Amino acid sequence: EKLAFYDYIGNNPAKGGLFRTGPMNKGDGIAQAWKGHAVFRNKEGEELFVR
Amino acid sequence: EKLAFYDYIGNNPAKGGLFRTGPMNKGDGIAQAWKGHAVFRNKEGEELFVR
Amino acid sequence: MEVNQLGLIATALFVLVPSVFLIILYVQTESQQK
Amino acid sequence: MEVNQLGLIATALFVLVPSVFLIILYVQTESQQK
Amino acid sequence: TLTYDDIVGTGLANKCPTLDDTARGAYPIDSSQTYRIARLCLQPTTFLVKEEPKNKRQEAEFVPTKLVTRETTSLDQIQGELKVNSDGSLTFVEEDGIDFQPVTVQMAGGERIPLLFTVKNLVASTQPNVTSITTSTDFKGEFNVPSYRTANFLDPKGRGLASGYDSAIALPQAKEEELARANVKRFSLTKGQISLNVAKVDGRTGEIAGTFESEQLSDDDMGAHEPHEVKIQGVFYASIEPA
Amino acid sequence: AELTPEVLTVPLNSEGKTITLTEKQYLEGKRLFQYACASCHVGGITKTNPSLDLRTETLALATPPRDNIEGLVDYMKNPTTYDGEQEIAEVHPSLRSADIFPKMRNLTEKDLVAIAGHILVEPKILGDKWGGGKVYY
Amino acid sequence: SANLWERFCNWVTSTDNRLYVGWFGVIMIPTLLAATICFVIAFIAAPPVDIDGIREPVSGSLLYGNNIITGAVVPSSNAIGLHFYPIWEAASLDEWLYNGGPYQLIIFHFLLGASCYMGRQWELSYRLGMRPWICVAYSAPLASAFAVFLIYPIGQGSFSDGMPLGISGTFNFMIVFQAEHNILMHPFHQLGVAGVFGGALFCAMHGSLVTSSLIRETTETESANYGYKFGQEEETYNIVAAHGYFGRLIFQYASFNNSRSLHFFLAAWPVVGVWFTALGISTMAFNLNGFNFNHSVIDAKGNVINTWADIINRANLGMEVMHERNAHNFPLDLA
Amino acid sequence: METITYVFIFACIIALFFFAIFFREPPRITKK
Amino acid sequence: METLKITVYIVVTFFVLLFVFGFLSGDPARNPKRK
Amino acid sequence: ELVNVVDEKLGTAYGEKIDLNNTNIAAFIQYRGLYPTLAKLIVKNAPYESVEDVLNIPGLTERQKQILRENLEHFTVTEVETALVEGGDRYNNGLYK
Amino acid sequence: MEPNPNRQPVELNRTSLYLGLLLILVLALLFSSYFFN
Amino acid sequence: LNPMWRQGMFVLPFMARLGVTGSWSGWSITGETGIDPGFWSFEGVALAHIV
């Protein structure tokens, strides 16, 4: 889980604002668990990827 | 309705506190409607009264 | 906890304002020649 | 509305504190003899 | 032999008796002669509290905890019949005794975890065919874990189950659905698991000794919140006699 | 509003017959009741066992009936449990045990009758107060 | 060096110190710093205390949900009673904070130091050539802290019954006390309020009489206070004009003209009254309570005719019947 | 937020204490 | 923990000695006149 | 739904008659000759499936059985409620005068 | 103690008070929006 | 998933970078238990500076 967590833009220091005060938690919230890896596919079975 | 409303201890100025600030509405809430007169009775049909 | 929102500012100005008063005087007294 | 709770006190002390500063000086200057 | 004064204040009173390194024998069972336990005794050594894996179910383990109350943990004076069974096994059946003690332990966070460490209504059993009680002759069974606080207990605001207030009388016109759980007191009753595994026998006097491990739930506080899982390790001492 | 002889007329035995006490006996009982009872029966209750009181009705359902002079008197001589199925003179003051409860040594049949009369007269005056406890103080 | 120790003793005892650290001070200064430092931390961060020994923790610190008015430092456990509970008596601090250890560390050091504080109020007076006895005035308020923090607990069998260290915690001590002892109906408490009421009264009398009979030496627009210089020879008010007015308010012989007799009375009254109040709490610490006039006046038939004394008993029962909800298992409250 | 406010004022009173004891106006005799 | 006890004890002894050996040091002497 | 088992029990037989499986021992003091001896036996002798099962307590002298028969109309029986039986609350539920 | 000889008096004229306040107030009019955010 | 840097901790990290990783209350930055930080726990450091 720890490893997956670093791969979330919500921990990227480059996101945010000057008057968006407080901990990172007042934002997206206190992380509880990893929902899991999401694989998208289309009717043909082809695997798609989210930009 | 108006008449029934005056017969509610929540409009009695003698209830309250020195640091219980604000309108009467921050207390019991904004009055919406009169639920109606409540008559209590016991198995024998006798009508009881709430002190 | 479940406190009053204005409690903080009520306490802050309750302390600041009159303290600032006294202080303005004391310093202007203190600096009077002689 | 859905504003910041500390906004009020942040703005209050932001105005009061330095204003109280200047004022303390001006009055102590103003009352210096001769 | 130590009189009362010879123990008072030493903490010695909260310690189940011990057998010496010698006593590693075996006690005989007549199977045609009723037997009873004149004195079962359980002394806690550790209290582990399984931690809630947060939302991320990752499998949780038991963790040590500090004993915030004091040396008041031991169960003593337990007693009942140790009936011999057809298959030659033994099952202990408790009748009465200081069979429970309210314990409170703290955790990493600082959280106090109160539990009613007990073995009420124990029903321990052994292996089939057990002519004589040798070292490590496992006893296993369940017991009942009654609510931590009993029916009459009142919360800081007067509300109670068998007695006390009906609601949050301090908030006369507040919505009640939200307060439901804390106004309506529930009395929890659950089962527990324990295993007394011998280590020292002494057929001579018929007094075995050993160590135990039991698991049970902690206080749910009249059902206001979920109970924590607890594991308890310690030592025990039993006095078997024909009677 | 007074203690008339009408109020001092309490049941003597089980067969309805009554006796009438006099303002002297009353006071005297009241004094004796304090001397050897109040200690534990102050105000009609029972400190070392709050489940059994001196309310006349309680004494009525006792066994044997202890709600009359004859009854209470027997009791003060040979005490029993509420079902009467057991003598308790050993842990309850009584005549047959004055060696153990000295306060009961002086006590003579005249005294026992007064104490008994007091118990039946009090609730007549005080009412609910006599039986109940602090709730009624 | 005239001799280190010889010197040390000259410093300690020196009357040239900004604050007179005396001989008594050598015990005071440390005990008082411990009491104070432990308190402040407790009051702010200590966790819940099982005051009644029934595993029902009462949190009384700011960080655990309290505010200045409610917050307090909770008394040691009842499981502990009168036993000594120094930190080195606990498997851990966690255990020590749960059984109310901080309470003892505080009351003992405070009471210790506050006594030496008295011992000091003597010493300095000696090193300065002034008459003693001031320290004897301070014996009253001290004798109270003692009564409320130690005598009462010794008497009652537990430190858990000592007065808590907090605002509301004190009201608790009072309300319950009243229920178990009916103090308002005790001679000693009454003498206490006479002394306190009286004190405040007299404090106002003197204060006004004097301030009102001050010799004019100030401008119409100048603080009337400046009319006094530190280190004056003669008096700053007309004690003869003061007496002149006050003697006419009531009547001459019922008025002071001797400043010394005035000031003795001024000190004697409150101190004597509080001494009795302190002896009240120290006396009701052995269950010799206030007058019990319950069901005294009864009528011609035997009916009970209530007096205000009875209306007081009901209010007391309410307190009795509700305090310590879960701590009692039996009929009589003998503890 | 409340805790901070309570401790702050307390901390301010103790500061006052200090200055009052150690930074008073030296009390001068006769001449004034 | 058994240590702290020791330390505390030492510490209290110091001061208590400083106290007795103090008034012992001819305290009556210390004062304005007659000594 | 969360309900106060005790306040609910008061809407059944318990609450109208002496519950042989729940009601506290002192309740037996309101009928002639049941208290000391019998009440102990009744309570001590676990739960009952029906009021009559009381008549079956081992040892009951012929007279006791007589008395019991007389007062059966004042008894009932309902599921054993833990909140009311735990803690030995049937021998002392913390109520006095 | 000797009257420390390194001290001078401090001054703030009326105009400075005004220029000062004008700055404090307007900064406050500029940042309050972001404080309340 | 909820480490100091998600909780707007600013000083707490500089104390771990050099050793102080425990609390007198029992917990620790790495997530271990039963550890004895001794006197130099975050509380300790904080205590020290104040003095």
Place this chain on the structure above:
Amino acid sequence: QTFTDPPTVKSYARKAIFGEIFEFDTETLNSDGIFRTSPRGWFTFAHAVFA
């Protein structure tokens, strides 16, 4: 309407105590359910003090 399940009956009985039973909107003002006094009350307190 009529209600017979103890809890609901008691709920209303618990309300009858204040006189006529009403329906409040507690959300809006985020009320707490603790009585506050009317202007009549405040004006009276303020003037009795000032006086």
